[PDB]
Amino acid sequence: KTVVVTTILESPYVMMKKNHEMLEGNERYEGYCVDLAAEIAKHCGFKYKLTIVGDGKYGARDADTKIWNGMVGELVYGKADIAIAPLTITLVREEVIDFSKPFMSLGISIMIKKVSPIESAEDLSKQTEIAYGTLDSGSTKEFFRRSKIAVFDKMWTYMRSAEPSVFVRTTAEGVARVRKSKGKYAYLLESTMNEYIEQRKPCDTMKVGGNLDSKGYGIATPKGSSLGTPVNLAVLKLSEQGVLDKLKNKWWYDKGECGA
Amino acid sequence: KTVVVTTILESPYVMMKKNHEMLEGNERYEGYCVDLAAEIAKHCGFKYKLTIVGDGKYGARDADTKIWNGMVGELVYGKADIAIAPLTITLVREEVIDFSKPFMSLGISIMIKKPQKSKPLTVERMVSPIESAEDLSKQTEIAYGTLDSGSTKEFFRRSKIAVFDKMWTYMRSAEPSVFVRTTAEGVARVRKSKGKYAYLLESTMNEYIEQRKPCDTMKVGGNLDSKGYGIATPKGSSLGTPVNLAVLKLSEQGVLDKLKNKWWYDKGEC
Amino acid sequence: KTVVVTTILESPYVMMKKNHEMLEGNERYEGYCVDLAAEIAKHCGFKYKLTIVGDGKYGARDADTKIWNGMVGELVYGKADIAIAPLTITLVREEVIDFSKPFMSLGISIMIKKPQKSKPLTVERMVSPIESAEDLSKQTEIAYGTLDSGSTKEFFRRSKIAVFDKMWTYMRSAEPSVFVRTTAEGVARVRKSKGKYAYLLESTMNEYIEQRKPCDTMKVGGNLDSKGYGIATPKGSSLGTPVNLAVLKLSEQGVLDKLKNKWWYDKGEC
Amino acid sequence: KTVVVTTILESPYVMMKKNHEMLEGNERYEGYCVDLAAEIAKHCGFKYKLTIVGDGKYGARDADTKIWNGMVGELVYGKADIAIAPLTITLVREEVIDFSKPFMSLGISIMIKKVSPIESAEDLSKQTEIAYGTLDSGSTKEFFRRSKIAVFDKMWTYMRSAEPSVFVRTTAEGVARVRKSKGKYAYLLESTMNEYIEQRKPCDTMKVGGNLDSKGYGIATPKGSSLGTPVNLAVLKLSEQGVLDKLKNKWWYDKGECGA
Ligand SMILES: NS(=O)(=O)c1cc2c(cc1Cl)N[C@H]([C@H]1C[C@H]3C=C[C@@H]1C3)NS2(=O)=O
Ligand SMILES: NS(=O)(=O)c1cc2c(cc1Cl)N[C@H]([C@H]1C[C@H]3C=C[C@@H]1C3)NS2(=O)=O
Numbered sequence A, D: 001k002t003v004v005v006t007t008i009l010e011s012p013y014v015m016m017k018k019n020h021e022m023l024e025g026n027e028r029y030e031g032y033c034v035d036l037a038a039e040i041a042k043h044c045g046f047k048y049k050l051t052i053v054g055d056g057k058y059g060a061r062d063a064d065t066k067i068w069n070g071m072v073g074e075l076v077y078g079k080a081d082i083a084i085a086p087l088t089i090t091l092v093r094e095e096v097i098d099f100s101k102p103f104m105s106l107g108i109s110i111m112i113k114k115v116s117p118i119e120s121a122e123d124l125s126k127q128t129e130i131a132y133g134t135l136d137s138g139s140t141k142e143f144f145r146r147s148k149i150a151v152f153d154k155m156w157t158y159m160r161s162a163e164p165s166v167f168v169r170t171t172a173e174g175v176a177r178v179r180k181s182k183g184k185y186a187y188l189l190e191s192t193m194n195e196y197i198e199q200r201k202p203c204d205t206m207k208v209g210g211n212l213d214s215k216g217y218g219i220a221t222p223k224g225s226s227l228g229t230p231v232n233l234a235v236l237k238l239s240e241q242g243v244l245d246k247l248k249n250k251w252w253y254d255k256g257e258c259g260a
Numbered sequence B, C: 001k002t003v004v005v006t007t008i009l010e011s012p013y014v015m016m017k018k019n020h021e022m023l024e025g026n027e028r029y030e031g032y033c034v035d036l037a038a039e040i041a042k043h044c045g046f047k048y049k050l051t052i053v054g055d056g057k058y059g060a061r062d063a064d065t066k067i068w069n070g071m072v073g074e075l076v077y078g079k080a081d082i083a084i085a086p087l088t089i090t091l092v093r094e095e096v097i098d099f100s101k102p103f104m105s106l107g108i109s110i111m112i113k114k115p116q117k118s119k120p121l122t123v124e125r126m127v128s129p130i131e132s133a134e135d136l137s138k139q140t141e142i143a144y145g146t147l148d149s150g151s152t153k154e155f156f157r158r159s160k161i162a163v164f165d166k167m168w169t170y171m172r173s174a175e176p177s178v179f180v181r182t183t184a185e186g187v188a189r190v191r192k193s194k195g196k197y198a199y200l201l202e203s204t205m206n207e208y209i210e211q212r213k214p215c216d217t218m219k220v221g222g223n224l225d226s227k228g229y230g231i232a233t234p235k236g237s238s239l240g241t242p243v244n245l246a247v248l249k250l251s252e253q254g255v256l257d258k259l260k261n262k263w264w265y266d267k268g269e270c
């Protein structure tokens, strides 16, 4: 039985190679998550077919409709059998799907244009001159929405009541906006994506401050699925063997198309 | 029905109170683990009694006897209900118990006695003799060791990486034995060896010892791997899901980092 | 029975919301005073509705009529039950209303236009034509004035000190009048006078305005006196004791300090 | 009817006269509080005699016996008609006696012997090397005991479980201990007393950091007494007339037996 794998077009996790027009099957995709899915399939022993989610949504709940979208919705409603993708392990997602152990640690950080005047998040929140947003239908926005800390609550009040719209449909759109806003815009995104962007050409974006929190990416399965324990054990074995560290080093720092 | 909470005696996770002789119950202990357990019980309401394992061992399945020992050993045999302790998630451990999501990150690091500042315009510079695991595994003047019956020993035993393979090859055959039973024993060995012994311990305990007096140690190099501590639970238990949800709630509520800052960086003597 | 709370329209005690055209009730205002009202209503259970006085004046007595106006005026004649507003405690108001213990300290200070950077090794220094109330009293190039129907005006009127007597003597018969109808109008006059006019206002408002953009002002010298802000209440009312105990509770708990820090130093710039 | 006035031997509030052995009546006492009592009695129009409380204690609740001591207990039990003294206005005291409007501003400050490694109270609480204590049966002790902030809770747990005893019987004993402990001790006391001590010979003590909180001194009076409103009005009149400022300048800065 072929296992349908859902995933998102995110770099360096999934990319459509360079000549994908002449390739078919799983051979037209590449990245960290493709290699991770290959290793998971090798360990468990099943045939898999990578599928990109129809809408570039990670997963959230809509406006009082109680319907899941994105990869989480693709998993809950029986469309996909597993989700190997940069899916953050969160409170609301775990109650509806099973998350394996985190295969990559991360945190929420700030990226700006290339001694920064803001650095820490308190200084950026206090200074209302420079705008900042997040990725819609993601986990950073839901982290700010449900946070009870004063600084994060103030930041959420700022971003919610912002004119014009400060949210970005895609993280690539957020990166382009940061590059094109001449330093008047800041981006709140995951640390791994921030490092990958800042270490890539044209290398004009830099990451300031520390990490607001600490989270992780997990391999998700539908609630009550038979693949949960096998993929959890596969992730543990891969972490012990160092395959995850090798994959991160290959896909994050091996090329390094900038001077640093 | 009141369930028991087994734990190891390790700082700053669990520490004895200064006047703990006359207190009784959960009040005799203090640290990150005790109020972690308090907040876990607050999230899902239940009565807990703190206990310390008799052998004082983290847990590692033996050889040729096929018997689990330590916290894991007494957890699989139904003498403990939940282990809110710095137990490291490990593949062989996961096959016999259940772990929650990691509540604090960690890594294997190197602790050596802090060298004295070099005299040589008048800027003082700190130079250590070991700066990475590869040069530690290449030399022989400095000996290194791990904690007996722990996750680090098992990690070094089964590692196929060349540097770690050489590390374990030297560790297994070395007189006197380079292994210690208590983390405090290893720290004392580092502090008394006069910069000729290196301790391979967890990064969290390493940094905690760095932050406290007499601060005669330094952490060299980066973490050798990435792992995490998980709250243990035996298979076929109804407490696994509530515990996991409680850990997720505490992580998303900004409580785990607050406790980490309170117990690690606030009381920084050095 | 729901009592009414009347407040003055000044920042940062009570400020209009940005998109305030759509919300109704107590959600149309924000600031230190609305938080104080919320905590007062939390310490003792009662429903409150915020109101703004029609005249917009703090309160005093009118000449040759002996009729109170302002917040005190609408408090004495039964049109209000409590005034959680920056109302200065004076002797002429204590004989007609009740005042709780002060919840914030204040003092009459001097606000002038901030001078420029003195170019003359290469170090910038701040020099102002006015450094204290005495030299402001002798000099006549710079005019000065106080808010009309306030507490500072009544303090300067009823003063026997020679410097303050001279201050009042100049203020009374100036051409044109040096008094202003609103603190915002006085600050606008200071900003538009090109440094030839100085405003005598409370230290709290002066500091808050100095901390906020465009921050073209600064406070010179020290406070001319020590005074406090009280929560007013009509004479013979069954709310003075609970309000006073609530203020004491908030001061002991540190709520007043955190509210001051949040509304004065967590929103400033330059 | 002669009004009995209770007070405490505190400098510069009440001092015993340099030639007091040859004087009788109220003429054998001097200080800020003596002049304040004289002005209060002049405004109100009554004959008063100054009485020093039989124990040099301000007032507190003892161990579960529910009995007030010091000046507060000298007022509640119908032995003193008014208390003009450096009595802090507090939550517990107000429920039992009436406090007039404050006539002095103050706060809890730290006094040490003359790089200043201590700085604010955070670094003093985080460093257990140097001991710190307060005055027993006062307001600082009851401020730390009932505090709910982490720093103040930690400080109170430190002082309570400290061997040997760290609380001083009298504030003068605290100053002597600070001067003699070779700077291994830190005194927590009101800012007014701290300034007066640091501005007097031998001028070997100094005050660091700011004030943790803001409080005030108030003229107390038995609950349900006719003197409350007249003394409140008198304090307000003296504050508007600038007599309290003049008295503070006379008794705090007029002499200044130190070079600063
Ligand atoms: N260095 S890294 O970010 O690629 C990374 C991060 C992590 C890894 C493995 C790697 Cl390689 N494994 C851990 C998992 C493994 C076992 C121990 C903790 C969890 C369960 N999660 S992690 O701490 O998020
Ligand atoms: N900063 S820290 O080491 O105290 C720390 C470390 C971690 C935290 C929370 C904190 Cl505060 N939560 C994560 C958990 C949250 C969700 C995502 C990964 C696991 C499930 N594990 S973690 O990456 O091991």
Ligand SMILES: NS(=O)(=O)c1cc2c(cc1Cl)N[C@H]([C@H]1C[C@H]3C=C[C@@H]1C3)NS2(=O)=O
Binding pocket: C101, C102, C103, C104, C105, C106, C228, C229, C248, C251, C256, C257, C258, C260, D088, D089, D090, D102, D105, D214, D215, D216, D217
């Ligand atoms: N630091 S501040 O100006 O916000 C401030 C000022 C004051 C506070 C509390 C604070 Cl936080 N409480 C005091 C009150 C408490 C008790 C002692 C004096 C009055 C009754 N009044 S105060 O001296 O006017």
Ligand SMILES: NS(=O)(=O)c1cc2c(cc1Cl)N[C@H]([C@H]1C[C@H]3C=C[C@@H]1C3)NS2(=O)=O
Binding pocket: C089, C090, C102, C105, C226, C227, C228, C229, D101, D102, D103, D104, D105, D106, D216, D236, D239, D243, D244, D245, D246, D248
């Ligand atoms: N400068 S000082 O400390 O001697 C000082 C301090 C204060 C004074 C008067 C003086 Cl002189 N009066 C005020 C009182 C007067 C009226 C206004 C606030 C209270 C009621 N309390 S105070 O703000 O605590």
Ligand SMILES: N[C@@H](CCC(=O)O)C(=O)O
Binding pocket: A058, A059, A086, A087, A088, A134, A135, A137, A138, A139, A140, A141, A188, A189, A190
């Ligand atoms: N990786 C995040 C989305 C990215 C973001 O929100 O910044 C998730 O899976 O929820």
Ligand SMILES: N[C@@H](CCC(=O)O)C(=O)O
Binding pocket: B058, B059, B086, B087, B088, B147, B149, B150, B151, B152, B153, B200, B201, B202
């Ligand atoms: N935390 C480790 C023990 C510490 C060590 O082995 O260094 C474990 O749970 O196994």
Ligand SMILES: N[C@@H](CCC(=O)O)C(=O)O
Binding pocket: C058, C059, C086, C087, C088, C147, C149, C150, C151, C152, C153, C200, C201, C202
């Ligand atoms: N706070 C003053 C008004 C401000 C002023 O007069 O400057 C009062 O309540 O009367």
Ligand SMILES: N[C@@H](CCC(=O)O)C(=O)O
Binding pocket: D058, D086, D087, D088, D134, D135, D137, D138, D139, D140, D141, D188, D189, D190
């Ligand atoms: N002045 C304080 C006592 C001094 C102290 O506690 O430091 C009071 O009257 O309560």
